[PDB]
């Protein structure tokens, strides 16, 4: 117990360096520097909504790390977790393969230095001659390399640190985004390592300053640089049983069952294909078992021949991360219904001010728009079309808000939010609409975007999973969705014998009534529901005010007999287990934090990489195409300079993204295409610190002269 009590009490970040079996704190102004030969320990403390403290324990192993040092650091992580009541999540991070949560801690990026305690090097603050290489993308990574032209190439950027003068050099085949990320590193050296007293000089090939050539000599010819699939839909779950390692498989299908987690045992979730494995500590497992949680997982990596660098995570029961919970069918946590937050608050959203919905103030806070999926109140001018054969036919204006599953509709809406305003194109593909009209609806949808100036937001929605914003476009009138039918002229035939509806309300108070099958299992305590005899207005336990008044407007167009749940008439159950667990609502954001991705459809292999940390507008590369994943929605940000193929692949990429998501995601999840510079409020609202004029001047040219 050296200086455990010095850290873990105030919310923040704390880093130590294992030096001869001892914890040595790293200078505050040096976090991000790590020696290839040493091992570090990191403690992330975030304020858990109400007033609690949540701990994330990472220990970091360099490449040139001695076996005695890795264990030394690995030992501390266990004893520290013990000192913090085992309620901390533990992480094994290896150089170059740090977890998404870990990378999010370092905005400026990481520096990998050559040296360590074994070679007698420290973290000094008060003459230098170093060379760094910054390659790849999104993840800033600067590795120290031999000081010679032998380390250079065209596709990457390099930094030559000389003390008073930092020289930045970018190859000819580099990109104007990578050069920007490298600027962050140079600022970190000029500001943090010199107390601001240094001249950062930049150059490109052929234009290298004199000081740079004097140490390297002449620049010869330099080469270029080089750098998957959807292999993360399936994962396996095992039970660990005891030196002699004994694992027993518990389930093979990725959509898991929460019940198989028994508190007396420990389990390992195998996602090694994607390079991650989890370790779950039950509350009733013996102490030696839970204290060997690290070395137990490491043996599993060996028994399966997974790469040594595979990420590891140890989760105590009741403190499961949102990534871990999504592997199970509808995670229902026991005593966490009321009260602020849930089991875990992702580090990149602990800073977001939770705003409740207030319709009177929506046209001011873009943050509220994003948090509730409402761009505005849904009262602007709206023009709807119905897909008849191979063109759009304007729908009966008095029937606005009625949609038949056998048709397909196109809705052009003009939303006014804040100062300016824009347009959103909604394509409603009915569940029973024929194959031709569905595809023709989406083609005419994309055409409508083209002839409108290529600016409005395209949003494809399937019958049954309509977004929250869509329900509130007809005033208080509820959106009604018939199962089968058609509003085509004279096409209406006759209704069915007896159908039953479910009236679900949103955060906005408006409601939608969707036709469903008349069976018992389709009953929901949270939602309201609506025979040749009469009509029953059944109100579930969770039924609120919106879906009761919505259920009378449904009755107004076609007489009521109100009846509450549990006490139903005798000839009423003339229609099994229904759903009783409630819906997430305000804390849905807690359980499913928003994540941002970059995607590419290169040579028959779809590849995505998650960008970590807090949502920063700067991470939206103009030539990339990004995925902003809410839970109810999947945004697609299309960079203006993206390839013409990926521009049109916007829909297909999101589809591929969802089909392969391990959560067995809802196949009808709405997908929303957004163009660069025309982001609706529900998209910009997630980026605290959004500058409209950010793209006005090129992002690379800004930071260029911004700091000399």
From Swiss-Prot:
Disulphide bonds in the chain: 157-170
Binding-site residues for Ca(2+) 7, renumbered to this chain: 526-527, 547
Pfam family, one: Gelsolin
Post-translational modification Phosphotyrosine, affected residues: 31, 344, 400, 536, 578
GO BP of this protein: actin filament capping; actin filament depolymerization; actin filament organization; actin filament polymerization; actin filament severing; actin polymerization or depolymerization; amyloid fibril formation; barbed-end actin filament capping
Binding-site residues, Ca(2+) 3: 155-156, 178
Residue(s) carrying N6-acetyllysine: 519
Gelsolin-like repeat ranges per the UniProt record: 21-103, 140-212, 252-324, 390-471, 511-573, 608-683
Biased composition (Basic and acidic residues): 189-204
Tissues and organs where the protein is expressed, per its UniProt entry: Phagocytic cells, platelets, fibroblasts, nonmuscle cells, smooth and skeletal muscle cells.
Keyword Secreted: yes
Residues recorded with modification Phosphothreonine: 669
Annotated residues for binding of Ca(2+) 6: 449, 454, 456
Key words, A-Z: Acetylation, Actin capping, Actin-binding, Amyloid, Amyloidosis, Calcium, Cilium biogenesis/degradation, Corneal dystrophy, Cytoplasm, Cytoskeleton, Disease variant, Disulfide bond, Metal-binding, Phosphoprotein, Repeat, Secreted, Signal
Region annotation (Disordered) ranges: 189-227
Record note on what altering residue 156 to N does: In AMYLD4; does not result in actin depolymerization in absence of calcium
Residues holding Ca(2+) 1: 37-38, 69, 117
Subunit structure: Binds to actin and to fibronectin. Identified in a complex composed of ACTA1, COBL, GSN and TMSB4X. Interacts with the inactive form of EIF2AK2/PKR. Interacts with FLII.
Similarity remark: Belongs to the villin/gelsolin family.
This protein's domain notes: Comprises six structurally related gelsolin-like (G1-G6) domains, that, in a calcium-free environment, are packed together to form a compact globular structure in which the putative actin-binding sequences are not sufficiently exposed to enable binding to occur. Binding calcium may release the connections that join the N- and C-terminal halves of gelsolin, enabling each half to bind actin relatively independently. G1 and G4 bind two Ca(2+) in a type I and in a type II manner. G2, G3, G5 and G6 bind only one Ca(2+) in a type II manner.
This protein's name: Gelsolin
Natural source organism: Homo sapiens
GN (gene name): GSN
């Amino acid at each position: 117990h050296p200086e455990f009590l010095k850290a873990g009490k105030e919310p923040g970040l704390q880093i130590w360096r294992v030096e001869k079996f001892d914890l040595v704190p790293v200078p505050t102004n040096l976090y991000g520097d790590f020696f290839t030969g040493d091992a570090y320990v990191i403690l992330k403390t975030v304020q858990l909504r109400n007033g609690n403290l949540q701990y994330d324990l990472h220990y970091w192993l360099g490449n040139e790390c001695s076996q005695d040092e890795s264990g030394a650091a690995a030992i501390f992580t266990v004893q520290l977790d013990d000192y913090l009541n085992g309620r901390a999540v533990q992480h094994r991070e290896v150089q170059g393969f740090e977890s998404a949560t870990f990378l999010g801690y370092f905005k400026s990026g990481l520096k990998y230095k050559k040296g360590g305690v074994a070679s007698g090097f420290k973290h000094v603050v008060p003459v230098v001659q170093r060379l760094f290489q910054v390659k790849r993308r999104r993840v800033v990574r600067a590795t120290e390399v031999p000081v010679s032209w032998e380390s250079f190439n065209n596709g990457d950027c390099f930094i030559l640190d000389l003390g008073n003068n930092i020289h930045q050099w970018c190859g000819s085949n580099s990109n104007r985004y990578e050069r920007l990320k490298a600027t962050q590193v140079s600022k970190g050296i000029r500001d943090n390592e010199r107390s601001g007293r240094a001249r950062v000089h930049v150059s490109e090939e052929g234009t290298e300053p004199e000081a740079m050539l004097q140490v390297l000599g002449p620049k010869p010819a330099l080469p270029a640089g080089t750098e998957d699939a959807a292999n993360r839909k399936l994962a396996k779950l095992y039970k660990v049983s005891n030196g002699t390692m004994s694992v027993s498989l518990v389930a093979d299908e990725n959509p898991f069952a929460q019940g198989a987690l028994k508190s007396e045992d420990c389990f390992i979730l195998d996602h090694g294909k994607d390079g991650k494995i989890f370790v779950w500590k039950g509350k009733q497992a013996n102490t030696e078992e839970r204290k060997a949680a690290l070395k137990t997982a490491s043996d599993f990596i060996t028994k399966m021949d997974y790469p040594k660098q595979t990420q590891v995570s140890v989760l105590p029961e009741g403190g499961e991360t949102p990534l871990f919970k999504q592997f199970f069918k509808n995670w229902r946590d026991p005593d966490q219904t009321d009260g602020l937050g849930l089991s875990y608050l992702s580090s990149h959203i602990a800073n977001v001010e939770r705003v409740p919905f207030d319709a009177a103030t929506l046209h001011t806070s873009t943050a509220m728009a994003a948090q509730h999926g409402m761009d505005d109140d849904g009262t602007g001018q709206k023009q709807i079309w119905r897909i008849e054969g191979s063109n759009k036919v304007p729908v009966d204006p008095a029937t606005y808000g009625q949609f038949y599953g056998g048709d397909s509709y196109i809705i052009l809406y003009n939303y006014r939010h804040g100062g300016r305003q824009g347009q959103i194109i909604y394509n409603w593909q009915g569940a029973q609409s024929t194959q031709d009209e569905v595809a023709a609806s989406a083609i005419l949808t994309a055409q409508l975007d083209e002839e409108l100036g290529g600016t409005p937001v395209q949003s494809r929605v399937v019958q049954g999973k309509e977004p929250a914003h869509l329900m509130s476009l007809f005033g208080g009138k509820p959106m009604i969705i018939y199962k089968g039918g058609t509003s085509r002229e004279g096409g209406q035939t006759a209704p069915a014998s007896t159908r039953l509806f479910q009236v679900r309300a949103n955060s906005a108070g408006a409601t939608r009534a969707v036709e469903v099958l008349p069976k018992a299992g389709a009953l929901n305590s949270n939602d309201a529901f609506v025979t040749p005899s009469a009509a029953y207005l059944w109100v579930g336990t969770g039924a609120s005010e919106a879906e009761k008044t919505g259920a009378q407007e449904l009755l107004r167009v076609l007489q009521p007999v109100q009846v509450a749940e549990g006490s139903e008439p005798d000839g009423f159950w003339e229609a099994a287990a229904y759903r009783t667990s409630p819906r997430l609502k305000d804390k849905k954001m807690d359980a499913h934090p928003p994540r941002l991705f970059a995607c590419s459809n290169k040579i028959g292999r779809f590849v995505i990489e998650e960008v970590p940390g807090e949502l920063m507008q700067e991470d939206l590369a103009t030539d990339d195409v990004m995925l902003l994943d809410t839970w109810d929605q999947v945004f697609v940000w299309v960079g203006k300079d993206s390839q013409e193929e990926e521009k049109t692949e916007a829909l297909t990429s999101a589809k591929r993204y969802i089909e392969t998501d391990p959560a067995n995601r809802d196949r009808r999840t709405p997908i929303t295409v957004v163009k660069q510079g025309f982001e609706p409020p529900s998209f910009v609202g997630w980026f605290l610190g959004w500058d409209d004029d950010y793209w006005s001047v090129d992002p690379l040219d800004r930071a260029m002269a911004e700091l000399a």
